[PDB]
Design a protein around this ligand. Sequence first.
Ligand SMILES: [Fe+3]
Ligand SMILES: [Fe+3]
Ligand SMILES: [Fe+3]
Ligand SMILES: [Fe+3]
Ligand SMILES: [Mg+2]
Ligand SMILES: [Mg+2]
Lengths: 172, 172, 172, 172
Amino acid sequence: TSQVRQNYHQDSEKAINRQIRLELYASYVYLSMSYYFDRDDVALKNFAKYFLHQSHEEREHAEKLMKLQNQRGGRIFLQDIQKPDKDDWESGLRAMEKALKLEKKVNQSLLELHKLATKKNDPHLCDFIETHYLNEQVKAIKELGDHVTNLRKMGAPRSGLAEYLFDKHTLG
Amino acid sequence: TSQVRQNYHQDSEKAINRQIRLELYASYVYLSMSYYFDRDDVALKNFAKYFLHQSHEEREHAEKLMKLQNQRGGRIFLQDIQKPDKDDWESGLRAMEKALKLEKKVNQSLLELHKLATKKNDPHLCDFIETHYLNEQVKAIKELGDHVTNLRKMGAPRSGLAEYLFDKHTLG
Amino acid sequence: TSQVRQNYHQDSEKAINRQIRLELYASYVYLSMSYYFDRDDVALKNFAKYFLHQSHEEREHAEKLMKLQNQRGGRIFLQDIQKPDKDDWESGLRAMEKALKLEKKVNQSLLELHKLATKKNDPHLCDFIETHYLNEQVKAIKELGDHVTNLRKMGAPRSGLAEYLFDKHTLG
Amino acid sequence: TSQVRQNYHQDSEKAINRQIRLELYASYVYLSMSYYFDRDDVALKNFAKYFLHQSHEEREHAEKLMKLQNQRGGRIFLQDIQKPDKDDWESGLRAMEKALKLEKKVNQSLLELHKLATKKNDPHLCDFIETHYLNEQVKAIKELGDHVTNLRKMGAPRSGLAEYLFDKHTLG
Ligand SMILES: [Fe+3]
Ligand SMILES: [Fe+3]
Ligand SMILES: [Fe+3]
Ligand SMILES: [Fe+3]
Ligand SMILES: [Mg+2]
Ligand SMILES: [Mg+2]
């Protein structure tokens, strides 16, 4: 038992390792999406930039959980990072729809993590998830929703103008 | 009788309280319009910003009439602020048409107030209405007409591309 | 159901609309109080400025709840803003006592909103209320308590001198 | 008849000369009031400064009407400036009550000047009075009302303390 450990349940410690893994997976998904938009046959530079910014933010989410595990005296166990569901993300609209689903999946995991921290009477952990994660997810979800709404109303993925102009005026 | 009151008719005083009520109501309509465009399924940020700015402007209009009431030694009496006629404003084009209608309604009420101030030989009040309100209405109605014309020529409300581009290039 | 909605109970959505209406009502009460102190027969400019500031803050409170409703994929439903209880607020001390009572009423509403968010296991909503509302209420109640205590000790409302000097020295 | 004269009634020309004389008289009353507060047995320096400022403003009012007379091709006829009604202004509160009454008397004169300009279909003259005089009078009456109300509530003229503290805190 770590000299620093206090009011930190073993279930919490394991759940934090699972969340770390999911943050690294989200990072990998956004990295894949980014370089899809960098292809000569896709060529939407601001989509590529938007998703690469998202990838680097997911790495920071992972690192802060690894910091928290060590702050509380838990022990980091890293696992294989699963390749994303797709190599070819098909269009700007479909990548955004996939990004929205991923952020709701990360959010559901953080809500399941807060539920566990609540059951284990770990208010430090509850505060950590609320301060650093829950509102980040609600903002990322609302923004991706906003982007999907716009791309659909502009007439994507059909009208080829829509994704070009959304790339320039919203993501650029 | 207020020690400041001079050449200020009872009817003028009563009409100023009702104008205060109409300005607060216009603030509320514009607040409703703003947050409609903030919805994830509408997501036109510059429409939202535009209508929130009108909302704070209507607030200032109400406050300056409340200042005038006291300057002339009238007494402010407030009523319920009615909720806007719509919860859903349907489109950018439809919200601009409703704003055009609201601004003409507020202008008509100010022209009635000026007619009453004239009938009661109150040139201070006539000057107040002309200096601070009448040209502000004409400018607002012209701007909203210009917006409605461009949204119609661009092919709104059908073309969601039209509202997206108007949002960026006119209201941005 | 909105594409962004996740872990957001219908009861919490309805409770956020009721809180939006109570924030707009508190804005209206403070606007009424402000322009009472602007009357030529009351003439306390710093009481007037103090309540106008509180009025503008209550609107910001309203607006942040309207943003949250859309962030969580709820739907804003605005209602009639009821007129304030009084036209004539009697004195600086009585206006401050009524403001204290209003802030405790808004606080009670927020504490019941937090109880519902807790019962519905909505930690994002709990965090929102804690971060943006609960300590604002505690500070507003404490400050109004401080003001009522000073106005009472100075001999209000049996000294027009007390309200005059408090206006200059505390609210100035 | 002057080469510049156009749409300028003989009655309006005579009324502008009468207003010039009343503005010079108001300047003289405020000069008298100012140097009352400068006496060693009254000694309220900010009452003294306040009324000297009002004296200098009334002269500017006089001068702008003299410019207008020449602008419209009227002929200035100056008369004897009557001494003020009082040598001894009794107190800060009585001087302020007399100043309020003077400003309402000057306002009544201006409103009768506007009635004549309206009856003679002189919109230039109507605009001049509205733009430069009517709101100045409304503000001066409101400010004097505010001051009388504060001096009364503070316990003037049964407190030399009230007039002392008002001099420091409002007129300082
Ligand atoms: Fe993340
Ligand atoms: Fe308005
Ligand atoms: Fe509030
Ligand atoms: Fe004058
Ligand atoms: Mg908690
Ligand atoms: Mg917390």
